Design a protein around this nucleic acid. Sequence first.
RNA 1: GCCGAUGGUAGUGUGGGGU
RNA 2: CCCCAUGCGAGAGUAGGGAAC
Length: 185
Amino acid sequence: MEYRLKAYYREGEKPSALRRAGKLPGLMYNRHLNRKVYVDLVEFDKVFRQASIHHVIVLELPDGQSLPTLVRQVNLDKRRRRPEHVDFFVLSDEPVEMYVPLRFVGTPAGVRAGGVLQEIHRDILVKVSPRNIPEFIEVDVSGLEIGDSLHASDLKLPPGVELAVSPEETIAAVVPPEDVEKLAE
RNA sequence: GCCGAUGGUAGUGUGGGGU
RNA sequence: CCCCAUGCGAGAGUAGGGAAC
Ligand SMILES: [Mg+2]
Ligand SMILES: [Mg+2]
Ligand SMILES: [Mg+2]
Ligand SMILES: [Mg+2]
Ligand SMILES: [Mg+2]
Ligand SMILES: [Mg+2]
């Protein structure tokens, strides 16, 4: 899934003025470029709600140029729920680190035994070329027995995608019942 | 658990203005 | 305190680097 968004450059125009004018200040960069830009907040909110930091957002620049990007950061004005600044990591020719969602599948054999399944991670940090960005990484936990742990090194990675975290990183585990992470009593 | 921008923000110097 | 103008500018995070592959 890929998205589009119109971006415009900026120089002297003050951030507070831009925000006031319904625009969101921000900037795009990579080992090659760095340029101050801005985008309409409503457009962004609409787009980011679908792309987040997992899908490529194509920025339509004034110079008719288009840049494939990934949202790297969104500074929220403290004391509210609203973006005050955003970073766009411009995808290039080299691989990049990024967060891919994990899609857990299957019921742990240890869960059939009354065990408790715990998904420690929701997303995983992997390294990959913009060409091979995966939509999600499926994770089958049907094998987990009470007291087991699926580690990053256990994840079945797509061709081109590799771990950007320690192989020993715990992705999931199945723990024994009778309270095993506090008990609402 | 190293170095580290730019951008934005907090804070702030000076001048002016204003609930 | 807020805004405008003008000069600085963190902390935390990101790019990039170091290290590693
Ligand atoms: Mg002071
Ligand atoms: Mg700065
Ligand atoms: Mg800093
Ligand atoms: Mg790094
Ligand atoms: Mg090797
Ligand atoms: Mg490397």
